[PDB]
Write a protein that binds this ligand. Structure first.
Ligand SMILES: [Cl-]
Ligand SMILES: [Cl-]
Lengths: 214, 211
């Protein structure tokens, strides 16, 4: 109003400010002697104002805070790391125009936001517990929230190591998003049974395209 | 040099427990676009031999597997690596677009890298200031070590998410890295069997340690 919308990071503040942050955070690794860093400095201010609500811009001075950068393989400066939910989602190395940054941001932030017909049930069933009856039982029980299109029992290996844990994600696609919303609200945090189940929206475009990895 | 014929019974062994990356094609004889991509997959099978195996599951003959992966329309291609689904592609595709798909998801296929990634070597809790130096000493056996990165990554968007450790080892030239990957892959380190693989050099050069 109109003050500074940039989060000014330290090594000590980085975890809370970036990794445990709400929404997408664009981290700028910089230094005062860095010419191209000052290039993008005013661009970052505009982006910070114009992406209010969908992006927070943060800066870490690598001279004053030398601990963080080497952990993320920062080489040249400036480097932009885009974080989403504690995850590095994208990177951009070096200076770039306002248009090039927007193009990079537009391509790496969620587009066509939408309430999904797809629910994902997590931490509900161990892979060994799966049998021929499970899909049918899920569709039957979720049918009290609305019309169930398809139920997918998905097993996911949580690593590349030979005996990495396999977990189960249960996907329930409803006919319309209103039904999915009721189901999620009713089921999330509830015990079925012995296990506390996470009920959650799952990206509809991903699901429609046979990507069950998220 | 040729394509694996998958069945519902063989899938686990042929795909999930296989050595090297596997490109799985879900198809059927009446499927027009499936036949359109068949000669393309033949060429990919020959051209990417020793780096990728192509495999086909006829969904009429073998109806058990595809619904487990959320397959809807055909053809659908799934890229497997070490029992993980690395990437997915829905519908028909040109020789070039499939090569672009493979370049983006098959580490090393566009360029053999100076960078090795070590997976499953250590727990986050077992990291200390000694580790980086121990790795470079251990990897020095294979050549000049430019840089070792002990990278901690969150596995997923949800806060519950497990944190894992990826250890990046960049060598001076790709030949040294190849020696290192050969000698380290599948090796046991105090209770843990490690995965050593090429990591895309361009990702690494650009501080993309997420793959
Ligand atoms: Cl600052
Ligand atoms: Cl051994």
């Amino acid at each position: 109003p109109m003050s500074d919308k940039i989060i000014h990071l330290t090594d000590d503040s980085f975890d809370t400010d970036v990794l445990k942050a709400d929404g997408a955070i664009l981290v700028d690794f910089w230094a005062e002697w860095c010419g191209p860093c000052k290039m993008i400095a005013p661009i970052l201010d505009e982006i910070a104002d114009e992406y209010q609500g969908k992006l927070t811009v943060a800066k870490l001075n690598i001279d004053q805070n030398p601990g963080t950068a080497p952990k993320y393989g920062i080489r040249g400066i400036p480097t932009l790391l885009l974080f989403k939910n504690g995850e590095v989602a994208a990177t951009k190395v070096g200076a770039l125009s306002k248009g090039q940054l927007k193009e990079f941001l537009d391509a790496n932030l969620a587009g066509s936001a939408m309430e999904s017909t797809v629910m994902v049930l997590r931490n509900m069933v161990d892979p060994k517990d799966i049998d021929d009856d499970l899909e049918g039982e899920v569709t039957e029980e979720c049918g009290k929230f609305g019309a169930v299109n398809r139920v997918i029992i998905y097993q996911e290996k949580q690593g590349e190591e030979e005996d990495a844990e396999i977990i189960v994600k249960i996907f329930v696609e409803f006919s319309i998003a209103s039904e999915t919303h009721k189901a999620i609200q009713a089921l999330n945090g509830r015990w079925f049974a012995g296990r506390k189940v996470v009920a959650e929206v799952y990206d509809q475009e991903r699901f429609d395209n046979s990507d069950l990895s998220a």
